[PDB]
């Protein structure tokens, strides 16, 4: 069917593997280990000393609705706006509480 033929035409038209690169040196071949993560690079190097913490007191926002939160729930440690969201928070599925923490990089353990 023409739709499949057209899609295969586009796939062949777009592919780079069908194209020979005269500008590419065939003799050089990379080290297969060359792909390394930042932690590996920094750990092996041991200026990415440009990050900075803050000392000011941070504001408190509701983990559910993002509105300001007067309250921190001592049980689930979610911050919440009002009693309606406290009801929602306590009714959450057993996995969901850790997701609200984790959306702000917090975790319960």
């Amino acid at each position: 069917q023409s739709a499949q033929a057209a899609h295969q035409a586009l796939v062949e038209q777009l592919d780079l593997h069908s194209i020979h690169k005269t500008f590419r040196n065939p003799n050089w071949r990379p080290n297969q280990r060359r792909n390394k993560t930042i932690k590996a690079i920094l750990g092996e190097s041991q200026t990415n000393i440009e990050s900075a913490p803050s000392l000011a007191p941070m504001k408190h926002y509701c983990d559910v609705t993002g509105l300001p939160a007067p309250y921190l729930d001592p049980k689930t440690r979610l911050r919440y706006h009002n009693k309606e969201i406290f009801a929602m928070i306590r009714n959450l599925p057993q996995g969901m509480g850790e997701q609200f923490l984790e959306a702000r990089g917090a975790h319960t353990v």
């Binding site: 005269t22 792909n35 690079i41 900075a52 504001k59 609705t65 993002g66 509105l67």
Partner: protein, 447 residues
């Protein structure tokens, strides 16, 4: 009555990254690159983690703007291998890998990068021999620079290479002379003080928040808002278009936030995104969580049209504000943009011994670069935040770059073949002796 008085909702379709058209190789550019005078032609590549931009230094705009992604697979029924290296990855298998480590400015998958460079030179019409100008992350890692320059010299054999910072090329293109360069990009947000056209990179600071993190955070929020299950497949490419089209910086966040879900006028503050669908005495009207999730209208799960739509609400303004309140809103545990810029102007630069007329020299041009600065009220928010930290009546101006995405490439294109640049070029024969970590230190580059 409280909803029946409202008009039918205005609703916006989802947008996503997609393949648009075939781009044949631009052989006309290759011919011009041979006709132009000796030593006044270079290939200029901006390594955007969101978009690799590449073209001819003698031209006013890049020839390519391409995501740094590859795809490589076999149609096993067909036996032939296929490979793709940009928006030819349909970002229809979407069997994709990316050159950059996600949420960083550093290239890390060099096989992907090498396939992206291969795509670039094919599309520029290489028939091989041409100087290359390539942008870097600030404080780009030596190993990453070594690996890129090894690819440029060993694989592609190019005659010369120079590395400069994208935000500093952007500043030069906007008549930058001295100033505070504030960049927000895909990877990160940086504040760079520039003195007498030279960046004081020892006083640069990085936030580790950017347009990537905003699209990822917006996705975490939408997954939480609809944790009962949104029936459409939420993707980070979709939330990236949501952050562009709908988010804005709040001029007074807590004042605006605390009333944001208030029921009157919520149909104005709310914007509604339609995912695609197919179809054959306390109550909701006084519940906050209905407003949050479904707005002023009643909701029914029977409608396939009214399911499969997300209501943005507080994340319209909550998402950009992570730049200003990172530890509060997203736990980033880093100083906000106004506190970083304030620390530089007020604490660092007046102490620095070689500088004169600090802060006022720098303070007269706080310069905004990179796409993730393009939020509404971003500039006014940064101005009013700094104005409180500076002495009264200090000559603060905040200024946007022209065309704050492409302008970083235009600066490198204009700079590419100046005598200042050609003194910074490294030749292949130097690289073979000095190695790939060595660079000519220059005002637009790393130390």
């Amino acid at each position: 009555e409280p909803w029946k008085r409202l008009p039918p909702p205005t609703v916006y379709p989802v947008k996503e990254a997609r393949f648009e058209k075939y781009i044949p190789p631009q052989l006309d550019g290759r011919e011009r690159a041979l006709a132009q005078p000796p030593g006044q032609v270079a290939i200029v590549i901006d390594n955007g983690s969101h978009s690799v931009r590449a073209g001819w230094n003698f031209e006013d705009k890049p020839r390519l703007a391409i995501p740094p992604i590859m795809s490589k697979y076999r149609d096993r029924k067909m036996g032939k291998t296929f490979s793709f290296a940009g928006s030819d990855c349909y970002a229809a298998r979407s069997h994709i890998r990316n050159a950059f480590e996600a949420g960083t400015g550093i290239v890390s998958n060099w096989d992907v990068m090498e396939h992206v460079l291969d795509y670039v030179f094919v599309k520029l019409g290489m028939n091989e021999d041409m100087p290359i100008v390539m942008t870097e992350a600030v404080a780009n890692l030596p190993y990453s620079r070594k690996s890129m320059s090894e690819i440029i010299f060993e694989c592609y054999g190019a005659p010369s290479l120079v590395y400069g910072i994208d935000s500093l090329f952007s500043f030069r293109h906007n008549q930058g002379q001295t100033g505070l360069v504030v960049s927000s990009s895909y990877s990160a947000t940086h504040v760079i003080p520039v003195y007498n056209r030279k960046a004081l990179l020892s006083q640069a600071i990085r936030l580790n928040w950017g347009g990537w993190h905003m699209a990822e955070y917006m996705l975490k929020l939408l997954k939480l808002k609809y944790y009962t299950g949104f029936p459409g497949k939420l993707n980070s490419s979709q939330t990236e278009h949501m952050v562009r089209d709908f988010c804005y910086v709040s001029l007074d966040y807590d004042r605006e936030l605390a009333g944001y879900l208030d029921w009157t006028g919520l149909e104005d503050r709310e914007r509604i995104v339609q995912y695609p669908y197919t179809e054959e005495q306390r109550d909701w009207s006084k519940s906050l969580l209905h407003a949050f999730r479904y707005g002023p209208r009643p909701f029914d799960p029977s409608s396939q049209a009214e399911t499969h739509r997300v209501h943005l609400n507080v994340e319209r303004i909550r998402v950009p504000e992570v730049l200003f309140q990172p530890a509060a809103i997203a736990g980033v545990d880093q100083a906000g943009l106004v506190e970083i810029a304030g620390d530089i102007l007020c604490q660092r630069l007046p102490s620095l011994p070689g500088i004169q007329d600090a802060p006022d020299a720098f303070l007269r041009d706080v310069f905004l670069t990179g796409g993730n600065t393009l939020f509404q009220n971003f500039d006014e928010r940064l101005r009013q935040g700094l104005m409180a930290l500076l002495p009264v009546g200090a000559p603060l101006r905040v200024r946007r770059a022209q065309d704050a995405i492409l302008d970083a490439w235009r600066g490198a294109a204009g700079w590419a073949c100046t005598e200042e640049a050609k003194a910074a070029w490294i030749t292949r024969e130097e690289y073979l002796e000095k190695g790939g970590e060595y660079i000519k230190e220059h005002d637009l580059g790393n130390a």
